[PDB]
Scaffold this motif. Structure first.
Motif, PDB file in Angstrom:
ATOM      1  N   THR B 209      60.320  26.486  47.532  1.00 12.25           N
ATOM      2  CA  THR B 209      59.123  27.360  47.746  1.00 12.25           C
ATOM      3  C   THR B 209      58.943  28.947  47.364  1.00 12.25           C
ATOM      4  O   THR B 209      59.775  28.958  47.441  1.00 12.25           O
ATOM      5  CB  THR B 209      57.680  27.054  48.569  1.00 12.25           C
ATOM      6  OG1 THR B 209      58.267  27.074  49.675  1.00 12.25           O
ATOM      7  CG2 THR B 209      57.671  25.042  48.457  1.00 12.25           C
ATOM      8  N   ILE B 210      58.153  28.721  46.573  1.00 14.74           N
ATOM      9  CA  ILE B 210      58.172  30.589  46.687  1.00 14.74           C
ATOM     10  C   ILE B 210      56.965  31.079  46.738  1.00 14.74           C
ATOM     11  O   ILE B 210      55.731  30.007  46.282  1.00 14.74           O
ATOM     12  CB  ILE B 210      58.212  31.489  44.626  1.00 14.74           C
ATOM     13  CG1 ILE B 210      59.467  30.834  44.470  1.00 14.74           C
ATOM     14  CG2 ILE B 210      57.940  32.962  44.660  1.00 14.74           C
ATOM     15  CD1 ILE B 210      59.955  30.850  42.496  1.00 14.74           C
ATOM     16  N   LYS B 211      56.583  31.970  48.162  1.00 15.36           N
ATOM     17  CA  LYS B 211      55.329  32.153  48.098  1.00 15.36           C
ATOM     18  C   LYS B 211      55.164  33.697  47.800  1.00 15.36           C
ATOM     19  O   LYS B 211      55.957  34.658  48.167  1.00 15.36           O
ATOM     20  CB  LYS B 211      55.135  32.095  49.532  1.00 15.36           C
ATOM     21  CG  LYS B 211      54.705  30.545  49.984  1.00 15.36           C
ATOM     22  CD  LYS B 211      54.583  30.244  51.777  1.00 15.36           C
ATOM     23  CE  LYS B 211      54.032  28.562  51.949  1.00 15.36           C
ATOM     24  NZ  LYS B 211      53.412  28.454  51.365  1.00 15.36           N
ATOM     25  N   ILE B 212      53.367  34.213  46.717  1.00 21.22           N
ATOM     26  CA  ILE B 212      53.430  35.242  47.553  1.00 21.22           C
ATOM     27  C   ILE B 212      51.943  35.873  48.216  1.00 21.22           C
ATOM     28  O   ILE B 212      51.404  34.896  49.078  1.00 21.22           O
ATOM     29  CB  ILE B 212      52.182  35.263  46.191  1.00 21.22           C
ATOM     30  CG1 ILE B 212      53.272  35.304  44.949  1.00 21.22           C
ATOM     31  CG2 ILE B 212      52.427  36.956  45.711  1.00 21.22           C
ATOM     32  CD1 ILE B 212      54.569  35.770  44.491  1.00 21.22           C
ATOM     33  N   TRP B 213      52.289  37.306  48.681  1.00 22.54           N
ATOM     34  CA  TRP B 213      51.705  37.229  49.706  1.00 22.54           C
ATOM     35  C   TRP B 213      50.410  39.334  49.979  1.00 22.54           C
ATOM     36  O   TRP B 213      51.492  39.357  49.092  1.00 22.54           O
ATOM     37  CB  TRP B 213      52.803  37.585  51.178  1.00 22.54           C
ATOM     38  CG  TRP B 213      53.620  36.506  51.114  1.00 22.54           C
ATOM     39  CD1 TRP B 213      55.204  36.201  50.667  1.00 22.54           C
ATOM     40  CD2 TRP B 213      52.853  35.814  52.483  1.00 22.54           C
ATOM     41  NE1 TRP B 213      55.415  34.984  51.718  1.00 22.54           N
ATOM     42  CE2 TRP B 213      54.153  34.281  52.689  1.00 22.54           C
ATOM     43  CE3 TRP B 213      51.688  35.487  53.432  1.00 22.54           C
ATOM     44  CZ2 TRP B 213      53.924  33.670  53.034  1.00 22.54           C
ATOM     45  CZ3 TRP B 213      51.545  34.255  54.140  1.00 22.54           C
ATOM     46  CH2 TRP B 213      53.104  32.846  54.434  1.00 22.54           C
ATOM     47  N   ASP B 214      49.354  38.938  50.003  1.00 22.07           N
ATOM     48  CA  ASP B 214      48.944  39.713  50.085  1.00 22.07           C
ATOM     49  C   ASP B 214      49.191  40.973  51.451  1.00 22.07           C
ATOM     50  O   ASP B 214      48.996  40.163  52.506  1.00 22.07           O
ATOM     51  CB  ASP B 214      47.297  39.702  50.093  1.00 22.07           C
ATOM     52  CG  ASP B 214      46.773  41.364  50.119  1.00 22.07           C
ATOM     53  OD1 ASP B 214      46.890  41.608  50.907  1.00 22.07           O
ATOM     54  OD2 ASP B 214      45.849  41.209  49.599  1.00 22.07           O
ATOM     55  N   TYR B 215      50.036  42.312  51.460  1.00 19.88           N
ATOM     56  CA  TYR B 215      50.521  42.573  52.605  1.00 19.88           C
ATOM     57  C   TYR B 215      48.942  43.335  53.598  1.00 19.88           C
ATOM     58  O   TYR B 215      49.585  43.637  54.918  1.00 19.88           O
ATOM     59  CB  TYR B 215      52.013  43.555  52.925  1.00 19.88           C
ATOM     60  CG  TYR B 215      51.845  44.748  51.884  1.00 19.88           C
ATOM     61  CD1 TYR B 215      51.127  45.728  52.627  1.00 19.88           C
ATOM     62  CD2 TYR B 215      52.352  45.110  50.668  1.00 19.88           C
ATOM     63  CE1 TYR B 215      50.801  46.893  51.341  1.00 19.88           C
ATOM     64  CE2 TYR B 215      52.553  45.902  49.941  1.00 19.88           C
ATOM     65  CZ  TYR B 215      51.971  46.579  49.725  1.00 19.88           C
ATOM     66  OH  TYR B 215      51.203  48.027  50.141  1.00 19.88           O
ATOM     67  N   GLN B 216      48.815  43.373  52.969  1.00 21.07           N
ATOM     68  CA  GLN B 216      47.050  44.135  53.532  1.00 21.07           C
ATOM     69  C   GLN B 216      46.433  43.441  54.732  1.00 21.07           C
ATOM     70  O   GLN B 216      45.908  43.417  55.656  1.00 21.07           O
ATOM     71  CB  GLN B 216      46.433  44.666  53.363  1.00 21.07           C
ATOM     72  CG  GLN B 216      47.820  46.412  52.058  1.00 21.07           C
ATOM     73  CD  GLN B 216      46.042  46.956  51.356  1.00 21.07           C
ATOM     74  OE1 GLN B 216      45.190  46.791  50.214  1.00 21.07           O
ATOM     75  NE2 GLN B 216      47.064  48.123  51.101  1.00 21.07           N
ATOM     76  N   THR B 217      45.943  41.699  53.954  1.00 20.75           N
ATOM     77  CA  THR B 217      45.374  40.899  54.580  1.00 20.75           C
ATOM     78  C   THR B 217      46.481  40.031  55.483  1.00 20.75           C
ATOM     79  O   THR B 217      45.835  39.325  56.043  1.00 20.75           O
ATOM     80  CB  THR B 217      44.562  39.481  53.807  1.00 20.75           C
ATOM     81  OG1 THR B 217      45.207  39.150  52.438  1.00 20.75           O
ATOM     82  CG2 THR B 217      43.733  40.830  53.588  1.00 20.75           C
ATOM     83  N   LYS B 218      47.339  40.051  55.077  1.00 24.94           N
ATOM     84  CA  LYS B 218      48.224  38.941  55.573  1.00 24.94           C
ATOM     85  C   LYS B 218      48.334  37.723  55.733  1.00 24.94           C
ATOM     86  O   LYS B 218      48.592  36.994  56.180  1.00 24.94           O
ATOM     87  CB  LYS B 218      48.352  39.062  57.136  1.00 24.94           C
ATOM     88  CG  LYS B 218      49.441  40.546  57.483  1.00 24.94           C
ATOM     89  CD  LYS B 218      48.447  41.314  57.547  1.00 24.94           C
ATOM     90  CE  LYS B 218      49.062  42.918  57.822  1.00 24.94           C
ATOM     91  NZ  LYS B 218      48.076  44.037  57.704  1.00 24.94           N
ATOM     92  N   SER B 219      47.616  37.400  53.916  1.00 25.54           N
ATOM     93  CA  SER B 219      47.692  35.631  53.434  1.00 25.54           C
ATOM     94  C   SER B 219      47.922  35.708  52.460  1.00 25.54           C
ATOM     95  O   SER B 219      48.785  36.013  51.673  1.00 25.54           O
ATOM     96  CB  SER B 219      45.988  36.192  53.565  1.00 25.54           C
ATOM     97  OG  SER B 219      45.381  34.692  53.117  1.00 25.54           O
ATOM     98  N   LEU B 224      54.119  28.410  44.790  1.00 22.94           N
ATOM     99  CA  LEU B 224      55.062  28.482  43.341  1.00 22.94           C
ATOM    100  C   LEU B 224      55.748  27.203  43.545  1.00 22.94           C
ATOM    101  O   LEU B 224      57.070  27.436  44.397  1.00 22.94           O
ATOM    102  CB  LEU B 224      55.607  29.598  42.562  1.00 22.94           C
ATOM    103  CG  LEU B 224      54.720  30.619  42.052  1.00 22.94           C
ATOM    104  CD1 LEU B 224      53.616  30.786  43.376  1.00 22.94           C
ATOM    105  CD2 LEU B 224      55.165  31.286  41.642  1.00 22.94           C
ATOM    106  N   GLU B 225      55.567  25.639  43.112  1.00 20.58           N
ATOM    107  CA  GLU B 225      56.441  24.656  43.437  1.00 20.58           C
ATOM    108  C   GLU B 225      57.500  24.515  42.216  1.00 20.58           C
ATOM    109  O   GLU B 225      56.114  24.637  41.032  1.00 20.58           O
ATOM    110  CB  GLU B 225      55.593  23.516  44.032  1.00 20.58           C
ATOM    111  CG  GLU B 225      55.086  23.961  44.760  1.00 20.58           C
ATOM    112  CD  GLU B 225      54.745  23.223  45.812  1.00 20.58           C
ATOM    113  OE1 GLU B 225      53.197  22.597  44.548  1.00 20.58           O
ATOM    114  OE2 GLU B 225      55.243  22.127  46.847  1.00 20.58           O
ATOM    115  N   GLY B 226      58.468  24.218  42.263  1.00 15.51           N
ATOM    116  CA  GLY B 226      58.650  23.450  40.758  1.00 15.51           C
ATOM    117  C   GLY B 226      60.584  23.373  40.482  1.00 15.51           C
ATOM    118  O   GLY B 226      60.913  22.890  39.844  1.00 15.51           O
TER     119      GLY B 226
END
Lengths: 5, 300
Positions: B209-219, B224-226
């Motif tokens: 997997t690949i993950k995208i993060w918001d560094y202000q909310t830490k969410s 991204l799967e494939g």
């Protein structure tokens, strides 16, 4: 032995 | 969703573990598992300079263009710096008691970060005789990747096989925060979105997997799967609204950075992909990637 490649 | 991908230059070589673009010369640096490093002019397809640095893998390499240097880190535990105009070896020192996985260079200050299998990140100051200015302790497995926040380089991120990303402030001993990524086979790579509109980071994992993060909310903004094997890297392109990833599955994937869906898969034909670079100012929207059997420079 991890990540040797 | 219109892509126009052209192959600018590809050449065969031993496994490319590190790769970087020069900001003002049409050059790419490759660092090889064989201990060799090569600087190529990808417009003329001619070698600028090459060096047999060591007999061990050189996993990390960057230009320090404002000093006419390259800096490289290798499995012999050492950081070495070379002037690319003369070939002078500028410095050569043991940086960690274990493999060096990643090097990052501060955009304005004479700071280099190195991440290591010794579980630490170390900060070096080349205007203070390459002093060890700080060691950042807290990770619990190999530190695979380090990166300055280009929008606030008093902070940086480290990605680690302990399944976390830690974001740190220079001069402070504990992380400002730790992202528990949920990528259970560890983090291989971490990258920052380079523009002011989004406080985003991205992580790649052996867990496919690949993950995208918001560094202000830490969410986690998106997953991204494939990919079909370990994901070596994932980065945001500096000019185009895309994310580029590469994997031991032998592919590069280009993802839409708004919808987070795959737009194109490239079967490069060089076996496993290990590393990636984007041209800092988007010249010809160039990207370059290193693989088991060589490297390729693509214009987008």
């Amino acid at each position: 032995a991890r990540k040797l490649d | 969703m219109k892509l126009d991908i052209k192959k600018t230059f590809s050449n065969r070589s031993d496994r490319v573990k590190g790769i970087d673009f020069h900001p003002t010369e049409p050059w790419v640096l490759t660092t090889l598992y064989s201990g060799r490093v090569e600087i190529w002019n990808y417009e003329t397809q001619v070698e600028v300079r090459s060096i047999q640095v060591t007999e061990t893998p050189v996993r990390a390499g960057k230009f320090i263009a404002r000093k006419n240097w390259i800096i490289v880190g290798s499995d012999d535990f050492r950081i070495r710096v070379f002037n690319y105009n003369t070939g002078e070896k500028v410095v050569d020192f043991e940086a960690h008691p274990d493999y060096i996985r990643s090097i990052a260079v501060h955009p304005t200050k004479p700071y280099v970060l190195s991440g290591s299998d010794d579980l630490t990140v170390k900060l070096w100051n080349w205007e203070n005789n390459w002093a060890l200015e700080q060691t950042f302790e807290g990770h619990e497995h190999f530190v695979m990747c380090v990166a300055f926040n280009p929008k606030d380089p008093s902070t940086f991120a480290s990605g680690c096989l302990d399944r976390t990303v830690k974001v740190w402030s220079l001069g402070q001993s504990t992380p400002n925060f730790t992202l528990t990524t949920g990528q259970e086979r560890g983090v291989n790579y971490v990258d920052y979105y380079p523009l002011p509109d989004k406080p985003y980071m991205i992580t790649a994992s052996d867990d496919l997997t690949i993950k995208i993060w918001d560094y202000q909310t830490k969410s986690c903004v998106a997953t991204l799967e494939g990919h079909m094997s370990n994901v070596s890297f994932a980065v945001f392109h500096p000019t185009l609204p895309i994310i580029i990833s590469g994997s031991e599955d032998g592919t590069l994937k280009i993802w839409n950075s708004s919808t987070y869906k795959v737009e194109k898969t490239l079967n490069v034909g060089l076996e496993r992909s290990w590393c990636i670079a984007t041209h800092p100012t988007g010249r010809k929207n160039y990207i370059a990637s290193g693989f088991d059997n060589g490297f390729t420079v693509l214009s987008l």
